[PDB]
Amino acid sequence: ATAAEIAALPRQKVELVDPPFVHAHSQVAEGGPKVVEFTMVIEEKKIVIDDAGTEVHAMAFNGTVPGPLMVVHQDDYLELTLINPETNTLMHNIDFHAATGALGGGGLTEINPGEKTILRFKATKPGVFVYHCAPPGMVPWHVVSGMNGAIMVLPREGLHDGKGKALTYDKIYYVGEQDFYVPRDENGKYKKYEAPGDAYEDTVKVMRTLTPTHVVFNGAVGALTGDKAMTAAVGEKVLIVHSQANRDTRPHLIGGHGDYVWATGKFNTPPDVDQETWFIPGGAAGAAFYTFQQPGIYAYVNHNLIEAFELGAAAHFKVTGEWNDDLMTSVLAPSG
Template sequence: MTFTPMTRRTVLAGAAIAGALSQVHAVVAETKEVLTPVAASAEGLPRVKVTLVDPPFVHAHEQVATSGPKIVEFEMTIHEKKIVLDDDGTETFAFAFNGTVPGPLMVVHEGDYVELTLINPETNDLMHNIDFHASTGALGGGGLTQVNPGEKCVLRFKATKAGVFVYHCAPPGMVAWHVVSGMNGAIMVLPRDGLKDGKGNPLHYDRVYYVGEQDFYVPRDETGAFRKYDSPADAYDDTLKVMRTLTPTHIVFNGRVGALTGDSAMTAKVGETVLIVHSQANRDTRPHLIGGHGNFVWATGKFHNAPDTDQETWFIPGGTAGAALYTFEQPGIYAYVNHNLIEAFELGAAAHFKVEGDWNNDLMTQVLAPTAV
């Protein structure tokens, strides 16, 4: 396969850095070399088409593969849109795989082939691509998936490593801006024989939820109020200045403050085992389930490593997805937070689990109610 580093696409990306973001629509279409490699070993394998669902939910899948490797087909459409981050009406422009922040969780088994159709509608302004941390090949597929508005491409890669992995947009010269504009998600590659504890015993989950933690950098005006802009191009220079301070204005789960609380809280029942997949494409994070634990935790998300057990808080490095299993033993509202508590309670990185069932007084009881001393 021939790969030319300097292409029309990289030139467009470089021009965008200089502020000329609106010129993508004016580029005349031209014939391009087909860069998608053909994996001979995938020929003849059965194909399965999966319809992705919005986080925190995850599409139906087998926990233990009941057949041999297959080609799993996914399709994602890129959205450029304005979103509201909090109840105060703070706005920012998001770049979103399939229209959600984070993008959908994709699930396959080790040895399967992931085949993604990536669509960039002509109504968008920018070039986008995708870098899969789960893939093997330079730039994680980023060099093979650079799509301008009005284009689509198809990427196929073999899932050779078991675990949960980040994917994100990575256009040349604009990687950080696109990632902190919400353009990231995760893929889960399950071992074909399912999850195991450190002794090789099988592990099973009754429910799975995907939490995508996202840092945003919204500029303020001279009075301290958050600015609003008419387009991503208008916001770019000011946003970059805030990004370079390394100080987020918002750190949220699933796209906005409170997105996974109240009526949108994640749910479970006493006795159910829940798998929590948690990604952070940019910054370190420290998930903690208040009143629960990580019975089995893959903090860096790789399933062939023995999981840590009985964790109170686990550390997920930036650019990584992690996974934790917990069997709920008591009912109630559980807060699931980034245990940098400033980021959780001041900036927004908090969610809720609403758990139904009977209370077990042996595990916890109120011996004396609050009373005067």
């Protein structure tokens, strides 16, 4: 498009919603290309990540780990106002894997406390994509402090299967998975620090072992379990977007499947089908489409089961509806 054509595009502000929920959007694009405007304030804050009171100095887009999911369509522009309050102590920026140029935007968005910036980029490629902070020389430290999320760039005509039939979800969730590297003292007790920088050297030592102390969904062990389980109903079509900005994961819906899975996260790459466990490499997002067929509690996990059940990477779905004995039945219940 020419300069006048770009300047003439409608601008639309969108209010964000905290994960695993997702802001208002249409699957099929509404009108022609738009400049979709988002604002996020960066928060540095101590968060508790497990049932033992373990603290991380989180660095959180919009105050959440992961940062919120931003949704646009192919050939829209995403225009982000990024704000770094004066109360923060570190410089931050943002790299969109969906974007082209300047390291994904990081080169143009380096903001000190008390600064803001506005970045626009054209969303040329459909898919789910990681975004993360990336201050030169301190990239993994910000990322593993929770400073990452994802965006979804929908095809203008919505999702389709590998044969071109439309796939329309009834709901969408965004599960961001976070590897944390929390230092311990010589007694094995997790350490606490006054300021984020105080933890830097000890944390890098743990990072270098390549062994996270915690692997969590939505910023904490059990954050998506119990009264915070995700929900669905038999017959409901759900899209589950999953990201991991730094480390591999292998999502699995225990009791279900990935009917269609864009394992690479990219909608122009045909989805795998009938998946038991899919694979998302560190630095990427993926998306799975499932139609629920049975009610009950499902577990949604990283299927390294030590990571899932010892280190924190397990969520639940609570699903309503009628049991289907054709699909599964207890012929003889546990009996002596």
